């Protein structure tokens, strides 16, 4: 599949893009205001994301620190990121099909559309100020408004059992952007798309 990631905020972000264990493409790059990035991402890749990481310092080996989203360190992503950090998750070339979604589940840092570019199935979103609106508890002095499991560290919050329900917190994120995932058992916001199709993901949509 390719996809192109494009960097419609007034800021700079540090994209990111991983399957846990080995980076996407060239796994990170710097994105300033208008720019964009195309990767190719190999058939049949599970549980891949892309994400945006903010207020980022490189040295020119790569190796630094970002506020949200920082993965070890390293501007070539191998691993997923700290939290906050809104998620555009995929699962490609399943059983003819492709499953995409947007995830709060590990909080919020930068507004994201996630759509395809092909036909065939529909795009989501979630572009709502949660930084701005974000209850104190929640709130990341960093940048960014984490998930309720990362800051109380609770069976509740972080599903541990695979049996929680809805709690305040993640009712916060569904009222603001409903096609996300709010909690681990969330009625599923997952849009099934024709197999090997393409995408854009766009940080600020709206802006
Ligand atoms: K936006």
Redesign the pocket.
């Known amino acids: 599949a390719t996809f192109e990631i494009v960097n ?1 905020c007034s800021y700079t972000v540090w994209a990111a893009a991983s399957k846990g264990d080995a980076a996407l493409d060239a796994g990170g790059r710097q994105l300033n205001s208008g720019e964009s990035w195309t990767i190719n991402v190999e058939p049949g890749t599970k549980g891949g994301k892309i994400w945006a990481r903010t207020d980022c310092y490189f040295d020119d080996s790569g190796s630094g620190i970002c506020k949200t989203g920082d993965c070890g360190g390293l501007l070539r992503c191998k691993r997923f990121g700290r939290p906050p950090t809104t998620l555009a998750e995929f699962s490609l070339n399943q059983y003819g099909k492709d499953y995409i979604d947007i995830s709060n589940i590990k909080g919020f840092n930068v ?1 994201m559309d996630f759509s395809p570019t092909t036909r065939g199935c529909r795009g989501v979103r979630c ?1 709502a100020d949660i930084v701005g609106q974000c209850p104190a508890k929640l709130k990341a002095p960093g940048g960014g408004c984490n998930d309720a499991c990362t800051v109380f560290q609770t069976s509740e919050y972080c599903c541990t059992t695979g049996k929680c329900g809805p709690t305040e917190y993640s009712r916060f994120f569904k009222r603001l952007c409903p096609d996300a995932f709010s909690y681990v058992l969330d009625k599923p916001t997952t849009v099934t798309c024709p197999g090997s199709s393409n995408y854009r993901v766009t940080f ?4």
């Open positions: 419609r507004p572009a600020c949509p709206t802006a």
